[PDB]
Design a protein around this ligand. Structure first.
Ligand code: NI
Ligand code: NI
Ligand code: NI
Ligand code: NI
Lengths: 172, 176
């Protein structure tokens, strides 16, 4: 029933563990329980969009990142690139689909909060040609991380899944 | 963007707004809504310990801080000072009595989440002499952060709440 009282120095953690940052997500959990505190490297290797019913906080300790987001507040979508430079703080709200584009030799922090009872995450792809939803997978509420891996992998393998229903483009 | 799509450079924000971080209001709120993301300078201390039904994440951008916690896991309490050095990340779990000590020209980030609605925040004072609980107050849900300075003032101005029942030590809301 005892809890950790030992802080972790990011620089030192990085000096020792930066190799633990592995594709296609490049993340590791520094702390868990109530919040998940991730440290993320690059370059990451994905085109998928995360939908998380809770908010997400990004801070770039080193280098810059690209947070592609979709604004769905109004009748039709807005596809926006949010450049988060070194030293940049940014809080993304619940339900905003987002696709972090990460580069080599960069370090970011991502804080997430645990999800309540009935709020499933989703992983979504958009068509490079027409920008309709190509494929959407709802994630089953546990071990999110190995599910966000087995969905990309299953996407990478399923050509009928990678095919836009609308314009019929095969999404690379 | 009916939400913010504009990140904040903390270094540039600091050059611009360093004075916001001065006492008595040493915390500035960079982002709100689901998470409350604060940037916090010093010096700042109070005798009180906060009890958050949810976790608090600390990160020291510049300089170190002192996070005093009570571990209530066993029969006797354990009063631990967690030193959070520059560049340190630390997750504090829910329901851990805690009391942040911040020092002059330091910079911190704190991240907290908006509470469920059925478990309140508490504010608590331990005797400086015998470390027995001297006073505790439950905080209201709807009124966030303003019920705090109201509870410190109330503690400050009531001597019998300020007095330890056990050793009779006159306690304070702040050092000296
Ligand atoms: Ni996400
Ligand atoms: Ni298409
Ligand atoms: Ni607190
Ligand atoms: Ni006492």
């Amino acid at each position: 029933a005892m809890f950790n009282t030992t802080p972790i120095n990011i620089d030192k953690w990085l000096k020792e563990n930066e190799g633990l940052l592995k594709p296609p997500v490049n993340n590791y959990c520094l702390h868990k329980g109530g919040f998940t505190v991730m440290i993320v490297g690059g370059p990451n290797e994905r085109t998928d969009y995360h939908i998380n019913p809770t908010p997400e906080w990004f801070y770039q300790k080193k280098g810059s990142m690209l947070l592609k987001v979709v604004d769905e507040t109004d009748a039709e979508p807005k596809f926006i690139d949010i450049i988060i430079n070194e030293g940049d703080s940014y809080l993304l709200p619940g339900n905003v689909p987002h696709s972090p584009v990460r580069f080599a030799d960069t370090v970011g922090i991502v804080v997430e909060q645990d999800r309540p009872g009935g709020e499933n995450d989703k992983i979504r792809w958009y068509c490079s040609h027409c920008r309709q939803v190509v494929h959407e997978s709802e994630l089953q509420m546990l071990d999110l991380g190995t599910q966000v891996k087995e969905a990309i992998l299953d996407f990478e393998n399923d050509v009928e899944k990678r095919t836009c229903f609308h314009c019929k483009t095969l999404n690379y």
